[PDB]
Design an enzyme around this catalytic site. Structure first.
Site, PDB file in Angstrom:
ATOM      1  N   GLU A  75       0.792  -1.248   0.000  1.00 25.62           N
ATOM      2  CA  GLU A  75       0.000   0.000   0.000  1.00 25.62           C
ATOM      3  C   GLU A  75       0.819   1.290   0.000  1.00 25.62           C
ATOM      4  O   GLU A  75       0.444   2.232  -0.694  1.00 25.62           O
ATOM      5  CB  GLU A  75      -1.079   0.023   1.115  1.00 25.62           C
ATOM      6  CG  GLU A  75      -2.231  -1.010   0.981  1.00 25.62           C
ATOM      7  CD  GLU A  75      -1.859  -2.461   1.208  1.00 25.62           C
ATOM      8  OE1 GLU A  75      -0.801  -2.732   1.775  1.00 25.62           O
ATOM      9  OE2 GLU A  75      -2.637  -3.325   0.778  1.00 25.62           O
ATOM     10  N   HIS A 132     -12.094  -5.278   8.222  1.00 26.13           N
ATOM     11  CA  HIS A 132     -12.917  -5.177   7.027  1.00 26.13           C
ATOM     12  C   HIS A 132     -14.067  -4.156   7.154  1.00 26.13           C
ATOM     13  O   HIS A 132     -14.935  -4.079   6.261  1.00 26.13           O
ATOM     14  CB  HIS A 132     -13.499  -6.555   6.698  1.00 26.13           C
ATOM     15  CG  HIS A 132     -12.590  -7.429   5.884  1.00 26.13           C
ATOM     16  ND1 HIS A 132     -13.078  -8.541   5.238  1.00 26.13           N
ATOM     17  CD2 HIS A 132     -11.257  -7.386   5.606  1.00 26.13           C
ATOM     18  CE1 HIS A 132     -12.095  -9.140   4.591  1.00 26.13           C
ATOM     19  NE2 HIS A 132     -10.980  -8.470   4.808  1.00 26.13           N
TER      20      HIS A 132
HETATM   21  C1  TPP Z   1      -2.266  -4.738   4.101  1.00 29.69           C
HETATM   22  C2  TPP Z   1      -3.229  -5.645   3.423  1.00 29.69           C
HETATM   23  N1  TPP Z   1      -3.523  -5.465   2.147  1.00 29.69           N
HETATM   24  C3  TPP Z   1      -4.379  -6.278   1.481  1.00 29.69           C
HETATM   25  C4  TPP Z   1      -4.987  -7.327   2.162  1.00 29.69           C
HETATM   26  C5  TPP Z   1      -5.972  -8.189   1.368  1.00 29.69           C
HETATM   27  N2  TPP Z   1      -5.467  -9.585   1.213  1.00 29.69           N
HETATM   28  C6  TPP Z   1      -5.938 -10.629   2.159  1.00 29.69           C
HETATM   29  S1  TPP Z   1      -5.034 -12.090   1.538  1.00 29.69           S
HETATM   30  C7  TPP Z   1      -4.238 -11.290   0.177  1.00 29.69           C
HETATM   31  C8  TPP Z   1      -3.310 -12.081  -0.724  1.00 29.69           C
HETATM   32  C9  TPP Z   1      -2.149 -12.554   0.129  1.00 29.69           C
HETATM   33  O1  TPP Z   1      -1.274 -13.329  -0.674  1.00 29.69           O
HETATM   34  P1  TPP Z   1      -0.083 -14.203  -0.103  1.00 29.69           P
HETATM   35  O2  TPP Z   1       0.640 -13.402   0.940  1.00 29.69           O
HETATM   36  O3  TPP Z   1       0.725 -14.669  -1.281  1.00 29.69           O
HETATM   37  O4  TPP Z   1      -0.776 -15.445   0.700  1.00 29.69           O
HETATM   38  P2  TPP Z   1      -1.705 -16.643   0.101  1.00 29.69           P
HETATM   39  O5  TPP Z   1      -3.146 -16.098   0.157  1.00 29.69           O
HETATM   40  O6  TPP Z   1      -1.241 -16.953  -1.319  1.00 29.69           O
HETATM   41  O7  TPP Z   1      -1.478 -17.797   1.005  1.00 29.69           O
HETATM   42  C10 TPP Z   1      -4.622  -9.953   0.156  1.00 29.69           C
HETATM   43  C11 TPP Z   1      -4.139  -8.938  -0.893  1.00 29.69           C
HETATM   44  C12 TPP Z   1      -4.662  -7.531   3.552  1.00 29.69           C
HETATM   45  N3  TPP Z   1      -5.188  -8.473   4.333  1.00 29.69           N
HETATM   46  N4  TPP Z   1      -3.765  -6.673   4.165  1.00 29.69           N
HETATM   47 CL    CL Z   2      -8.145  -9.720   4.307  1.00 28.11          CL
END
Ligand code: TPP
Ligand code: CL
Ligand code: TPP
Ligand code: CL
Ligand code: K
Ligand code: K
Ligand code: K
Ligand code: K
Ligand code: MN
Ligand code: MN
Lengths: 329, 369, 329, 369
Positions: C63, C133
């Site tokens: 972000e 959320h």
């Molecule tokens: C700071 C922030 N930005 C966006 C999100 C939304 N979000 C929840 S899971 C995710 C993807 C995470 O990907 P990864 O770290 O590769 O883990 P995976 O889901 O593949 O196990 C996102 C963007 C969040 N929780 N926190």
């Molecule tokens: Cl999330």
């Protein structure tokens, strides 16, 4: 009252609080940018030599890291005293403070906490600090349940409030008014003592108007009280708020019930400043006592300017003029 | 050269350093897709009881995932994140830790709790936010935490736990009691600023921490081609001075070996290690089942019986979790601070007064009183 | 009034605003996490296929990067429409928004600016979003001179306000109430139109009390007005604030001069919430007209809970009860 | 292996990847400490006029630094940051750019403006906050900016310009007019989260940007041993997929060559380059003076005459800057937004009324009216 004292300026009083903490709490560590050689405002001079490089140490130049790291130390129960080099540079850590530190205890059902974290940081204007050496960010943090925000007005007040923050079981932000670091000294007890959080101090009793401020601005309103007495025969009750959140609603409301008039002042910009919270609360609790609208004399809604600082700050003349108008309302 | 910032020779020709992304850091594997040990000197020769525990922990997690995923589709719980493809990375790494090593993670780490014997009732209690939840129903589902099993409560903002885990490792180092911290995160989360903070702080402050990155090729809809352009996350570790390895996350033994060695060296040396485990968004449970069969340690009858027993245990916990009341609504006000500020107590009293008058309009029915 | 319309829910109205922007402004790009496939709330569906992968694209998961990158695009004069996936995750970017974007024009003497930046982000409670959320961060941004903060109440309002933000020559944060994304549709003009910033809307005239809110909470106060009329014979003037900063002080003060009573409501926590700024300003300007203390009916000063949401939110009964008491003061 | 996250072979033995910090990325040098060209094939053979411009820009900067540093010691200006040791990195890199390439930086980049013929009057005007300052006296001294010379106004928060510079480079790529962006920062600033954001975004979004890190071994009191533990900043670049080089920052020709080639390839390929220039907190001006002497392009008389002329020009600008009034105090309210909100105009009117009554207590004397 508190044992032997010595004259200390505000930076020396902060070193004394920190020294006292490290001496009595073997878990405690101090860290941040440039703290090892004593800090850019001398607040940690001598502490590394006295307590060890594992206890007073420099981090990489990364504020989000400093706060995250401090939260982790505190999760283990160790006392973590983080420094942010100017309050203007606390914003990279805003997510770690607001989404993490403030919420740590609540969101875990008290299975984990970071109550042993204190974040200290120089604060407030300094004559020529301009946009990024001058800021007063307390209203940004006031809207975050789960942190405490504390601001002292003097060396005596700073050491007792800082020791309270370090010992308090909640993450605390302690803002040190940097323009006071080498201003006048006063007597400060050499041994540890505490000043309570969430408690305002009536430093002068008065009958006609209540004046509220914090930090260096307490001294401005103290002078405004003197000007109002001499020039207007008006008796001012002068209050130092000290803790921004949770704030001492009762002391302020008791004063305004007595005087019927309130002027709140702070260096921070007017809009969304903490004066708005005090004003709205006092209006709710003291409505029928209000003889005049509550006045807010604050910085303008601009960034903090370099060459224009003398014209920007809510100085004693700005406060006095507002007070004169309120007395005449 | 005499520059304090780096130790290096001069060079008299202009040459840019090129990343090697096409043949990246190789992927450590112990057993093949048929469950066969590839290099006998690498076999950990884990005893039968321990290997069966790995298998039963992965499958019980998978059983629970199936049921709670259905529960979410029906709106019985509000949210769920599964562990499919991540059972091996979590159970294999947890088995290599000491029981008191502190774990930080996020959404894919329930297998660590399962390996640590976290009760099915408590996974359920958190997802239902019921009276048995020690988190008091305050966080969305799968935001697990356990003080007794040293698993720090999950939070939704990605990567925030990374510099925290480094601070807890520093504190452990000072406490001098031979403990490591492990920190899990995905390859998406590794793009956050807080990842750069934690990797660097752990190196310069010499912290006994394992960073465990799960790379499954995707962060929500984002493939790794849009996430980074170097050789995944493992190639970042050496730039921070961190010892780094990449492993096959479908191989519990490769995960276990790397985690065991990283733990041994992290604690002894006070230095961070980075493990990047490659997974899919050829399954860890299948591969381990093939291994068990070769040893004569499992068969179809045992598989059938355990499928039945595990379904029964999950359904027993599920039904009980659904029938428990939710916590008292008063609990929305405690733990904001350790104490309750008077102004916050005033807000609690205002809710109590409100419910006295307007309570018929609130679901007071399945909340504790 | 505005040409051909079609029924659109709030997510569809956001896509329409974005489509209209990309069609008429060849500089404009949209980027953030997961926007390429249409977004996690479908707000960018079809836009990549229509306008090209160079114009609608995914960033890495960072972000602070998203906002920094957007500011840089805007420094060149190109329109930069950044997405932050939930308003709860805007905090890593707080330093880039507050220290950089808001101050860019001032600190350069207008040699540089990032006026062509808009940051859009889902906002507000959603029934089960819990701590991360659900958040409503507008009061954190209200204390920062140099940004605008805008929140719509419906699909028609969202498209006209978002087009205004994209075209406004100042960095804008546009908060989309996520609980409305797939709520009821309404007719929305297919072609571009604008609704002015810093302008409140009186959606129902009334004589006894002024009610102010924004986002989904406008609908709550609309219902409160109906309850007050039927149960109390009380006539409510209902106002949607729409822009948090700079806010429309005049429209709110004109209303309160007429009614003599004000109730402000928002989902965000009470302390330091934006209701405190409105209350303090209205008290200053409308003091002699105030028949009763200005009431603030807000979220409690806690993090936003999961299972307890029905008890946390300033719902129509909480608003109605406060209103009943104020009418009786 | 079949994992989308990385391209790599399997390995059947557990091996951690070790950072090479003791023999790091070598330091590119073109001329030695006596100003001699070491490898003729690397000599850029810059023409006499250009090389004299490099020399005179560095020395004029140094002249200005001496005078303004004294001015600060006396409290005539409130703050100052010198360029000592950084004259070569800035003048050598600026000379390798096209005049319209956009520059982002921070506190050590005044030489880029000096090379771009930024008037001495305007450096002075910013440090004094006088009426000639196009920044309107609003920022602390040395926070320079110039729209006409494509140098984005400096800001005090470290590293914030890094992901911004990447966004401006993306916008340039789309605009298709053969322009690069350069972004300067120190090795301390590289620890910030925003550095990790900008390096990664530039790689995945394929941006024509040069990242120019100045590594002088210290960030205030912090030596690099406390700043990082990898092989400086250059070794980080390949982990992000960024082509990277390290150069001798006391050698204007090595700086120039690396910047020229990075610019050529960044624009042609839409890919980021990282240059880490090693400096001291053996000086760039001395080394270049030795070179000039060998070519027969300078001598003691010319050196004397230029020392005199440059001191005279700086003192003329200095005296004029001190005697100019400050801007009208009204200017504290404009440019907060493009327009002035009515409520902000109300605050401006309140100051005007205030000064009408209490003006004797304000320094109205040297402010414009
Ligand atoms: C700071 C922030 N930005 C966006 C999100 C939304 N979000 C929840 S899971 C995710 C993807 C995470 O990907 P990864 O770290 O590769 O883990 P995976 O889901 O593949 O196990 C996102 C963007 C969040 N929780 N926190
Ligand atoms: Cl999330
Ligand atoms: C976010 C932030 N934190 C701290 C500071 C205080 N600060 C001003 S310069 C500096 C050291 C910077 O070091 P480096 O980037 O190596 O540049 P150098 O001074 O060596 O040229 C620090 C910590 C700042 N300006 N911004
Ligand atoms: Cl600084
Ligand atoms: K504390
Ligand atoms: K987290
Ligand atoms: K805009
Ligand atoms: K900067
Ligand atoms: Mn992933
Ligand atoms: Mn440095």
């Amino acid at each position: 009252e508190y044992g032997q004292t010595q004259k200390m300026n505000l930076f020396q009083s902060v070193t004394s609080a920190l020294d006292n903490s490290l001496a009595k709490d073997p878990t405690a560590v101090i860290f941040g940018e440039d703290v090892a050689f004593g800090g850019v405002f001398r607040c940690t001079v001598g502490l590394r030599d006295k307590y060890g490089k594992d206890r007073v140490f420099n981090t990489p130049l990364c504020e989000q890291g400093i706060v995250g790291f401090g939260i982790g130390i505190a999760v283990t129960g160790a006392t973590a005293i983080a420094e942010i080099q100017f309050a203007d540079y606390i914003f990279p850590a805003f997510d770690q403070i607001v989404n993490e530190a403030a919420k740590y205890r609540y969101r875990s059902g008290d299975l984990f906490n970071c109550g042993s974290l204190t974040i200290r940081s120089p604060w407030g204007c300094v004559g020529h600090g301009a946009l990024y050496h001058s800021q007063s960010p307390e209203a940004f943090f006031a809207h975050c349940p789960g942190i405490k925000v504390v601001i002292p007005r003097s060396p005596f007040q700073a050491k007792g409030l800082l020791l309270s923050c370090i010992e308090d079981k909640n993450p605390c932000i302690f803002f040190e008014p940097k323009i006071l670091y080498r201003a006048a000294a006063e007597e400060v007890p050499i041994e540890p003592y505490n000043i309570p959080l969430s408690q305002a101090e009536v430093i002068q009793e008065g009958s006609d108007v209540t004046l509220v401020a914090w930090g260096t601005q307490v001294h401005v309103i103290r002078e405004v009280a003197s000007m109002a007495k001499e020039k207007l025969g008006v008796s001012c009750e002068v209050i130092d708020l000290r803790t921004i959140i949770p704030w001492d609603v009762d002391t302020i409301c008791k004063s305004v019930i007595k005087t019927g008039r309130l002027l709140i002042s702070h260096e921070a910009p007017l809009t969304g400043g903490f004066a708005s919270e005090i004003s709205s609360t006092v209006q709710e609790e003291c409505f029928l006592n209000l003889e005049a609208p509550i006045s807010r004399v604050c910085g303008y809604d601009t960034p903090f300017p370099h060459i224009f600082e003398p014209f920007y700050i809510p100085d004693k003349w700005k406060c006095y003029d507002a007070l004169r108008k309120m007395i005449n309302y | 050269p005499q520059f304090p910032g780096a130790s290096a020779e001069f060079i008299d020709k202009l040459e840019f350093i090129q990343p090697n992304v096409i043949s990246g850091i190789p992927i450590y594997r112990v057993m093949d897709r048929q469950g066969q040990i590839i290099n006998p000197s690498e076999d950990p020769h884990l005893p039968k009881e321990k290997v069966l525990k790995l298998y039963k922990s992965m499958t019980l997690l998978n059983t629970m995932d199936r049921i709670l995923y259905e529960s979410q589709r029906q709106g019985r719980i509000s949210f769920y994140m599964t562990n499919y493809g991540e059972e091996g990375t979590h159970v294999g790494s947890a088995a290599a830790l000491d029981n008191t090593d502190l774990v930080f993670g996020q959404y894919r780490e329930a297998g660590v709790l399962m390996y640590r014997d976290y009760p099915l009732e408590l996974f359920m209690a958190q997802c239902y936010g019921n009276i048995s939840d020690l988190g008091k129903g305050r966080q969305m589902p799968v935001h697990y935490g356990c003080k007794e099993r040293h698993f720090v409560t999950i939070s939704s903002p990605l990567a925030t736990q990374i510099p925290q885990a480094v601070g807890a490792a520093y504190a452990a180092k000072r406490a001098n009691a031979n403990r490591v911290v492990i920190c899990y995160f995905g390859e998406g989360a590794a793009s956050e600023g807080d990842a750069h903070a934690g990797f660097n702080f752990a190196a310069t402050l010499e912290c006994p921490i394992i960073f465990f990155c799960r790379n499954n090729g995707y962060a929500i809809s984002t493939p790794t081609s849009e996430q980074y352009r170097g050789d995944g996350i493992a190639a970042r570790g050496p730039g921070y001075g961190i010892m780094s390895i990449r492993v096959d996350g479908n191989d519990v033994f490769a995960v276990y070996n790397a985690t065991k060695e990283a733990r041994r060296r992290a604690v002894a040396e006070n230095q961070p290690f980075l493990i990047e485990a490659m997974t899919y968004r050829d399954h860890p449970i299948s591969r381990l089942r093939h291994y068990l069969l070769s040893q004569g340690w499992w068969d179809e009858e045992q598989e059938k019986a355990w499928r039945k027993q595990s379904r029964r245990k999950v359904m027993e916990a599920f039904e009980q979790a659904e029938r428990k009341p939710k916590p008292n609504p008063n609990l929305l006000f405690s733990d904001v601070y350790q104490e309750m500020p008077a102004q916050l107590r005033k807000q609690q009293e205002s809710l109590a007064r409100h419910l006295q008058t307007y309570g018929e309009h609130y679901p007071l029915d399945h909340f504790d009183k």
